[PDB]
Design a protein around this ligand. Structure first.
Ligand SMILES: Nc1ncnc2c1ncn2[C@@H]1O[C@H](COP(=O)(O)OP(=O)(O)OP(=O)(O)O)[C@@H](O)[C@H]1O
Ligand SMILES: Nc1ncnc2c1ncn2[C@@H]1O[C@H](COP(=O)(O)OP(=O)(O)OP(=O)(O)O)[C@@H](O)[C@H]1O
Ligand SMILES: Nc1ncnc2c1ncn2[C@@H]1O[C@H](COP(=O)(O)OP(=O)(O)OP(=O)(O)O)[C@@H](O)[C@H]1O
Ligand SMILES: [Ca+2]
Ligand SMILES: [Zn+2]
Ligand SMILES: [Zn+2]
Ligand SMILES: [Zn+2]
Lengths: 362, 96, 193, 184, 48
């Protein structure tokens, strides 16, 4: 009975682990089909509705079936990941913590930094009795016992590692020997080790790929309520295709530099806004009507973000937007200001970004 | 140019020793001998510490080697710095 | 077939001008500069289209009033009522415009969603215009660089080692002029042929 | 220093390694202090020199600004350094570094909230899922479904991971709430 | 291309002697022997 149920469940786990990647492909395929159908929505006219007007007429039930299929496939993707990749992550964590415990003595000689979230969580796995369950060297508790027993206290180190000398010696001698039938539910309930499972669930929750799958999942579920959330699943082609991953790695290789370049551009635009707000204020009238006194640069915030938006977007610069300096006292000063804005903000910094991308690909 | 200069600095330091100028392969014939040479045999920090210790030491307390290096440092003659040779190269026969 | 069709309609003779690429080797090199990364270029265009689609989704959800394009105030000409029309409006004018979709759609001044529309326009300009076009340009530039570096590598390899046996040039050059003596008499490609 | 000199000039002598094993603790203590270089000797032979290194000198050598200055010096010498003037520039760098070192020594003499919130969120969002097994409702489930059905079994198998996902969602929401409380 | 050509010129002159064509390492086995060779043994101005 129990053997049959465990065997059938193991068969299910093996099937999902086998077909993890295929349904990962199929989810992207369904995400493409759903968005292709979505591209045909039409707005109809308080209350506003989006209706699907098509010559076929039948791709609305088809869209609903595709949404349901996408969610089912997505859930099976989490099942496949949890049966395929999770053991490897647990094995890597277990080997890392075992070697840090045995060689560096990160929990005996020194202590975790209290900033390392993984170390703070892995404090528990030592007390867990199933220390390296997946990691095949089941032997590290006694290795550490031999290495650090003499100084740090035999009993204290034994209690830190969760093992018990008296029971060890009594098991070496005669002990209580009685097996139990597998059909008993009490056997399974006692065999389950809540401490190790809590640690494993914490590790899995901290894992990034399973978090990405959960995000994909919540987006599919939300797409059921509002169909347009199915479009966010198109961000998955980047990891679907390795070559798109290379193209994105070209730009993401210098993300820190790109962000700091944007900060520098913002500071330069702020300085130009300061100069304009101090001297060149009349020229920022933007009202096409002469009568209305619409001023962009009366407020310092409005002047700055005007420079942020239109001066940056414009090919020539802020001068193409603000009034010409012809026949003015500050003609030459405004002119040098516009030329410098065009030369620095437009010609140089955008070139800096472009060169960042090019040389990263190089 | 900036990036290529950084690459050149890295390549030069990992390919040849900074002081004597012998290639990394000859030292690496012995396992790990290259960074062994660059961290114990010929160490930049070690030379700086030796200069500090020699400056701080009294004159008459100097040993023969210390006094000889002191005289070269006073006369600005840098022939005491090894160039194209090392202890292992000098004693290839005995050491191996 | 193009010449034969050009007899019926004389303008089909213009398609024969696509033959200069293989007529001149140097134009073949210039075209090889861009065609060296054709797969990457196509996938970059696909990525740009996906990003524009996401921006169209956002605009169709929230920023719809601003897409009125009728110069006449009376006529209610809406670009983004239909999702297809909104998307391809973003495909065409937002992509072509130097500043972005904001230079085409209505300004956000005095609106509840002013800051959100503004961040949307700034991000559109930064990603679609500044970055992806730069990605294409860098693809072309670095492909041409790859071609030149490959030529340099060929030259360096041939002048540093013999093609057949693979011994370095220095050993042969120990004897004066022995390297090219070896490569022209001892080990000659034409001689083996 | 005497034992190290003997060790480095008597490489093969086993009695010498026996003495070294006997005196490892002293050598372990004096490992940072002992420093070695090679110089072009007066007898036209490479000579190894041993001397005392102060731990203060080691610390003001290992301070970060000195390391950055050393990296900049390395960059400059690699890029525009001549073979004649390389050794001289190195000596000038050493002298300046020693002076700044001594001056530094002379002037010298005489997140956790977010981490804790996230950890606590982990604990009380995983104990919520542990509480089904703790409260043993699965036992009464077994009593009412004693007749083994593949339909029900597959449904429960899916429900396990479905509940895991709900616990993750609650965990993420709790983390965001705690972070917002921390920042505000 | 211009910059790489300048780098190649510099690298070639500092790596091998212009006249005989022997590598710098063999001369540098003797201290300072490479520029000693290029400034006294094999000098372009001296040949001119
Ligand atoms: N004579 C030398 N003295 C010191 N290091 C040398 C010497 N010759 C070559 N090197 C190399 O230069 C480097 C100096 O050490 P290194 O740069 O790793 O120091 P660090 O400050 O600890 O680290 P980082 O690599 O981040 O600068 C090493 O790679 C070493 O092998
Ligand atoms: N086994 C080899 N056979 C022929 N050439 C070799 C061999 N190994 C190296 N080489 C080198 O490859 C080159 C072949 O000759 P080269 O390229 O000069 O011919 P070409 O057609 O007269 O001129 P070009 O340089 O314009 O191609 C020479 O530089 C020669 O030294
Ligand atoms: N046969 C050679 N004759 C002369 N110089 C040679 C020869 N072989 C290699 N070289 C190198 O070429 C260079 C010639 O001297 P160098 O270029 O320094 O002259 P300069 O006019 O004084 O200075 P600059 O470096 O600014 O040109 C040196 O680095 C020298 O080592
Ligand atoms: Ca004396
Ligand atoms: Zn050295
Ligand atoms: Zn040959
Ligand atoms: Zn020569």
């Amino acid at each position: 009975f129990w053997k049959k149920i465990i065997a059938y469940q193991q068969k299910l786990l093996n099937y999902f682990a086998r077909n993890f990647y295929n349904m990962r492909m199929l989810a992207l395929f369904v995400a493409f089909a759903i968005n292709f159908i979505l591209l045909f929505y039409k707005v109809s006219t308080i209350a506003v509705h989006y209706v699907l007007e098509e010559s076929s007429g039948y791709m609305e039930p088809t869209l609903r079936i595709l949404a349901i299929l996408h969610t089912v496939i997505s859930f099976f993707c989490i099942i496949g990941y949890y049966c395929l990749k999770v053991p490897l992550v647990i094995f890597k964590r277990e080997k890392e913590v075992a070697r840090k415990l045995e060689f560096d003595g990160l929990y005996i000689t020194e202590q975790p930094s209290e900033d390392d979230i993984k170390g703070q969580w892995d404090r528990l796995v030592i007390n867990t009795q199933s220390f390296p369950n997946n990691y095949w060297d089941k032997f590290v508790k006694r290795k550490v016992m031999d290495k650090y027993g003499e100084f740090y206290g035999r009993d204290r180190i034994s209690e830190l590692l969760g093992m018990d000398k008296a029971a060890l010696d009594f098991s070496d001698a005669r002990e209580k020997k009685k097996p139990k039938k597998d059909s008993s539910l009490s056997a399974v309930l006692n065999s389950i080790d809540v401490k190790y499972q809590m640690w494993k669930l914490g590790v899995v929750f901290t894992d990034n790929s399973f978090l990405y799958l959960a995000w994909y999942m919540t987006m599919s579920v939300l797409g059921h309520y509002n169909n347009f959330f199915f479009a966010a699943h198109l961000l998955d082609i980047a990891m679907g295709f390795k070559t798109l991953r290379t193209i994105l790695s070209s730009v993401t290789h210098n993300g820190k530099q790109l962000v700091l370049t944007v900060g520098l551009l913002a500071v330069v635009v702020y300085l130009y806004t300061v100069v304009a707000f101090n001297f060149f204020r009349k020229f920022y009238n933007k009202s096409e009507d002469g009568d209305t006194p619409d001023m962009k640069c009366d407020d310092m915030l409005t002047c700055y973000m005007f420079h942020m938006y239109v001066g940056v977007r414009a090919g020539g610069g802020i001068g193409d937007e603000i009034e010409d300096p012809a026949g003015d006292e500050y003609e030459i000063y405004r002119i040098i200001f516009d030329i410098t804005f065009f030369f620095f903000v437009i010609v140089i910094l955008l070139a800096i970004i472009q060169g960042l991308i090019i040389d990263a690909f190089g | 140019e900036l990036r290529d200069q950084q690459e050149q600095v890295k390549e030069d330091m990992e390919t040849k020793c900074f002081i004597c100028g012998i290639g990394n392969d000859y030292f690496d014939t012995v396992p790990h001998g290259f960074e062994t040479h660059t961290l114990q045999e010929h160490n930049l920090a070690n030379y700086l510490f030796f200069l500090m210790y020699l400056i701080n030491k009294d004159e008459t307390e100097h040993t023969g080697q210390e006094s000889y290096v002191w005289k070269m440092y006073q006369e600005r003659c840098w022939e005491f710095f090894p160039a194209g040779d090392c202890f292992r190269k000098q004693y290839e026969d005995q050491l191996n | 077939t193009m010449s034969v069709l050009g007899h019926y309609n004389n303008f089909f003779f213009a398609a024969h001008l696509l033959d200069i690429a293989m007529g001149f080797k140097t134009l073949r090199t210039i075209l090889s500069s861009v065609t060296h990364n054709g797969k990457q270029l196509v996938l970059t265009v696909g990525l740009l289209a996906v990003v524009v689609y996401l921006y169209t989704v956002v605009a169709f959800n929230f920023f719809r009033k601003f897409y009125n394009k009728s110069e006449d105030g009376d006529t209610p000409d809406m670009k983004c009522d239909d999702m297809l029309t909104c998307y391809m409006f973003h495909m065409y004018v937002g992509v072509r415009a130097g500043g972005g979709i904001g230079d085409e759609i209505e300004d956000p001044a005095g609106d509840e969603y002013e800051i959100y529309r503004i961040i949307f326009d700034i991000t559109f300009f930064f990603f679609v215009i500044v970055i992806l076009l730069a990605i294409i340009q860098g693809l072309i530039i670095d492909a041409f660089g790859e071609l030149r570096d490959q030529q340099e590598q060929v030259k360096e390899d041939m002048e540093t080692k013999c093609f057949i046996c693979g011994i370095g040039n220095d050993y042969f050059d120990t004897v004066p002029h022995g390297f090219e003596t070896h490569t022209l008499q001892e080990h000659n490609l034409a001689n083996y042929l | 220093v005497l034992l190290t000199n003997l060790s480095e000039h008597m490489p093969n002598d086993t009695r010498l390694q026996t003495f070294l094993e006997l005196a490892e603790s002293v050598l372990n203590y004096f490992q940072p202090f002992l420093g070695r270089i090679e110089i072009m000797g007066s007898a036209k032979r490479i000579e190894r020199v041993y001397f005392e290194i102060s731990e203060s000198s080691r610390t003001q050598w290992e301070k970060p600004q000195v390391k950055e200055s050393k990296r900049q010096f390395i960059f400059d010498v690699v890029n525009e350094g001549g073979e004649k003037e390389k050794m001289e520039l190195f000596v000038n760098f050493c002298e300046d570094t020693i002076f700044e070192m001594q001056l530094a020594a002379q002037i010298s003499e005489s997140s956790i909230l977010t981490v804790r919130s996230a950890l606590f969120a982990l604990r009380y969002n995983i104990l919520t899922l542990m509480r089904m097994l703790s409260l043993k409702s699965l036992k009464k489930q077994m009593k009412k479904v004693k007749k083994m059905t593949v339909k029900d079994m597959v449904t429960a198998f899916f429900s396990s991971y479905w509940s895991i996902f709900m616990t993750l969602l609650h965990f993420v929401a709790s983390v965001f709430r705690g972070f917002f409380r921390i920042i505000c």
